[PDB]
Amino acid sequence: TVIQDTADVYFKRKSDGKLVFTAEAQTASFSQAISEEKLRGGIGNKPLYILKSEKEINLTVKNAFFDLEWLAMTSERYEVEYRTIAYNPDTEEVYSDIYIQFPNVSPSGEFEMSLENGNALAPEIKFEALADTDTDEMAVVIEAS
């Protein structure tokens, strides 16, 4: 009866592909709104229109485990790979999995330290997806089916 989407997130470096940490996702937000100039301040003309709208994506994880070699070896770019499984309404337990990944994700946490008192463990690592002049947004959708 519970949600069968206990996704697993793999955080790997973008330059070469080295794994940084594995974790189980906790929350993920898609933000979709305009603040370009003012509420209506886009540049254009009578015959011109540009969809300058910008989308900011944020993620976070739980059960974060770092790799021994990555901690031992210590413009960087990183990627996150989701791993879930499809479950259509028409067909349950779809063997075909579902892969999501962001090739360019920034590990810039909105939280900084989260100074707590209690002995509660919840190391949530908040990321955010970046962009480039070549590609507007980086994430990718794909299914085994």
Binding site: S35, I50, E54, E56, S75, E128, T133
Partner: protein
């Protein structure tokens, strides 16, 4: 016998003078519940059978002749009690009170954020353990947590012999807080900071970390109060509140129940007489803030107290939102004159900026409407913002920067610069703030898109004088100078780049050009292709000669070049070359789709450009009938190219947040699609509580 009353009240209250501030509600613990101290200074007869010392005390306060006959020592004690009660805010009996007034007088330098004065005071010498305690809290707010921990340990070592229970208690709690925060911060460094900062920040070396880890192992704070002498616990039952590990325990539950009552009032539309729920929770908020800042408790920097103030201030702000348009009924407004509306003063600004996280402020904006309330003490807010901006400029300019202070500070500075949208600032202060924002805010914690949108927010109450456009010019020229390197690219978290800086300048200054960009362009070569591509965005910021040279050196045979050219108005129509190029790009993406069907459907990255092409087809921009051949991807493609054929059950409501008013007007005028969008909007608003959908419906009342 007035002498007996003065002796009793002095014996009860004089030892509390050592504390810089005493909570109003917690006073009831001093007398063993003989009375009930309401938050607004009114004081209500508690179940008791006493002489009624408080009524007589206020009688002496009202009548000069009555107090004129007191003895010298009793008169001095009465004067001390008078100034104590005035300082706290206890006024008079509940019955005698007919009209009272509130106040906001948090008197902590650490609260105010005047880091230069904090550093100056730290540099100054010390003469009393209170001064050292102040300096410890100041250093901890300034991030020097090793120095703050050492000074707190020194404070403890002095207080154990000075025989001051309050200072020993408060320093013990705060040293435990600094240990907890330093441990959590170093854990965050070791784990994430490698990945986030891109480097292994170790402000605290391993030996000192091990030292603090070993120094007070098995230190249970819940036994701290019990471990103190009999006199302290008997007379400082007020201070049982902090000693628990979970400080803010009872007060959190009381805030929860007051929140419940306030929400019940909002749902019912009930009218509150006397002291409303909002007034009491506000006074408790301010009492806690004053208590912990004036007494210099480091616990204010923790997530427990940050969440507490976040919940309290949010509650006040949402209640004020309701009260701005609350039910009239013709009776509520008739009972009292005008309205005690909520206005955001300097202390509220400091509270919201410091104690919120940025996402919390975005939550407040989404739920409440902060632009519609009135702001006051603009001079104080300007001083606060100038302190913040000059602090970040002074620190980040220098290679030296306490990284732990950066972690403890960047949240505050981020929130202050984010929440200064609603404040008016002087041209001097505005210029300095924007200079700091554009230059010395670090790249790690603030990216280009966030930088631009925060500047754009900062330019709300005040337009752009020449100084601001000059500083933006300087920043953009610096970025152009740094963009020579072949291994450097612009990454935006929000999705806004320096082209938006240029658009901002050109919108706020129609006739504007830059000689620095013109002269850096005049010395360009075909070898440095990336710089050419970057400067392609800042075309209107160039001179005519530079424009001609830039046009000669490169064409627009590309999709990103096409988007940049149309955006800054280079091309008013799509030439055969441009439509051919986009057709080719869509062909290669389509064959990629055909290949990927077996591997899985993928449409997220280029969907921006598919949506753009679809809207262009809708807007009579692309006049080629080949566009129909590539229907089949549902990423706002069928939405625009073939609205009739699009499957509306795949519609997402969030696709109406991004469209501009021109495109909203155009899509509002179509008879083949309007019904689905309007019914989706109406059921969305009926089932949701977002104001943007109200705005769309206003634009789509049709």
């Amino acid at each position: 016998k007035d002498d007996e009353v003065i002796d009793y009240i002095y014996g009860k209250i004089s030892p509390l003078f050592a504390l810089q501030y005493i909570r109003k509600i917690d006073l009831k613990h001093v007398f063993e519940y003989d009375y009930h101290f309401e938050v607004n200074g009114t004081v209500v007869r508690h179940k008791n059978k006493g002489f009624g010392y408080m009524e007589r005390f206020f009688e002496l306060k009202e009548s000069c002749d009555e107090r004129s006959k007191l003895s010298k020592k009793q008169y001095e004690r009465f004067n001390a009690l008078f100034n104590f009660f005035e300082k706290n805010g206890v006024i008079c009996m509940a019955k005698d009170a007919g009209t009272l007034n509130t106040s906001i007088e948090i008197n902590s330098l650490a609260y105010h954020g005047k880091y230069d004065v904090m550093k100056k005071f730290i540099e100054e010498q010390s003469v009393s353990i209170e001064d050292d305690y102040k300096k410890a809290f100041f250093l901890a707010c300034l991030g020097r947590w090793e120095e703050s921990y050492d000074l707190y340990s020194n404070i403890i070592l002095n207080s154990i012999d000075e025989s001051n229970g309050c200072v020993y208690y408060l320093s013990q709690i705060n040293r435990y807080r600094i240990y907890q925060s330093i441990t959590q911060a170093v854990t965050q460094f070791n784990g994430l900071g490698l990945l986030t900062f891109g480097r292994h920040y170790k402000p605290f070396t391993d030996e000192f970390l091990a030292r603090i880890e070993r120094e007070m192992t098995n230190f249970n704070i819940d036994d701290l109060f019990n471990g103190m002498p009999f006199e302290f616990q008997k007379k400082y039952k007020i201070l049982e509140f902090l000693s628990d590990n979970q400080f803010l325990y009872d007060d959190t539950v009381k805030l929860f129940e007051l929140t419940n009552k306030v929400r019940s009032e909002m749902s019912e539309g009930s009218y509150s007489f006397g002291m409303s729920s909002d007034i009491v929770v506000l006074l408790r908020l301010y009492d806690n803030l004053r208590f912990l800042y004036e007494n210099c408790l480091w616990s204010v920097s923790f997530h427990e107290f940050h969440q507490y103030i976040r919940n309290s201030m949010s509650l006040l702000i949402e209640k004020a939102e309701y009260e701005r348009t609350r039910d009239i009924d013709e009776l509520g407004f008739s009972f009292f004159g005008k309205k005690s509306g909520f206005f955001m003063e300097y202390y509220d600004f400091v509270n919201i900026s410091r104690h919120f996280k940025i996402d919390d402020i975005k939550n407040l904006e989404r739920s409440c409407s902060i632009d519609k309330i009135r702001f006051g003490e603009q001079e104080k807010i300007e001083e606060y913002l100038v302190g913040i901006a000059e602090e970040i400029t002074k620190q980040f300019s220098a290679n030296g920067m306490n990284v732990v202070f950066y972690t403890q500070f960047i949240s505050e500075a981020k929130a202050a610069l984010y929440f200064a949208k609603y404040v008016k600032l002087s041209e001097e202060g505005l210029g300095k703030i924007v200079k700091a924002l554009l230059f010395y805010f670090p790249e790690r914690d603030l990216d280009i898109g966030k930088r631009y949108v925060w500047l754009e927010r900062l330019t709300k109450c005040n337009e752009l004088p020449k100084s601001i456009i000059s500083i933006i010019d300087d920043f953009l020229v610096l970025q152009a100078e740094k963009h020579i390197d072949q291994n450097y690219s612009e990454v935006s978290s929000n999705g806004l780049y320096s082209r938006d800086y240029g658009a901002l300048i050109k919108h706020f200054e129609k006739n504007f050009i830059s000689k620095r960009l013109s002269e850096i362009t005049l010395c360009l070569t075909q070898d440095k292709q990336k710089q050419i591509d970057f400067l392609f965005k800042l075309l209107p910021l160039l001179s005519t000669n530079a424009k001609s040279h830039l046009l000669s050196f490169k064409s627009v045979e590309n999709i990103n070049d096409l988007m940049n050219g149309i955006r800054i108005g280079l091309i008013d129509e799509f030439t055969p070359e441009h439509e051919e190029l986009i057709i080719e790009y869509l062909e290669t993406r389509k064959v990629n789709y055909i290949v990927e069907k077996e591997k899985g459907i993928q449409t997220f990255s280029s969907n921006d450009y598919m949506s753009t092409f679809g809207i262009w087809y809708f807007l009579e921009e692309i006049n080629n009938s080949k566009m129909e051949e590539f229907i089949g991807m549902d990423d706002q493609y069928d939405f625009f190219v073939d609205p009739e054929n699009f499957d509306y059950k795949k519609f997402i409501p969030s696709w109406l947040k991004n469209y501009n008013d021109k495109l909203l007007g155009k899509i509002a005028g179509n008879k083949h699609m309007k019904h689905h969008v309007i019914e989706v909007l109406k059921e969305r608003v009926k089932n949701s509580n977002d104001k943007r959908y109200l705005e769309i419906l206003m634009n789509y009342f049709i």
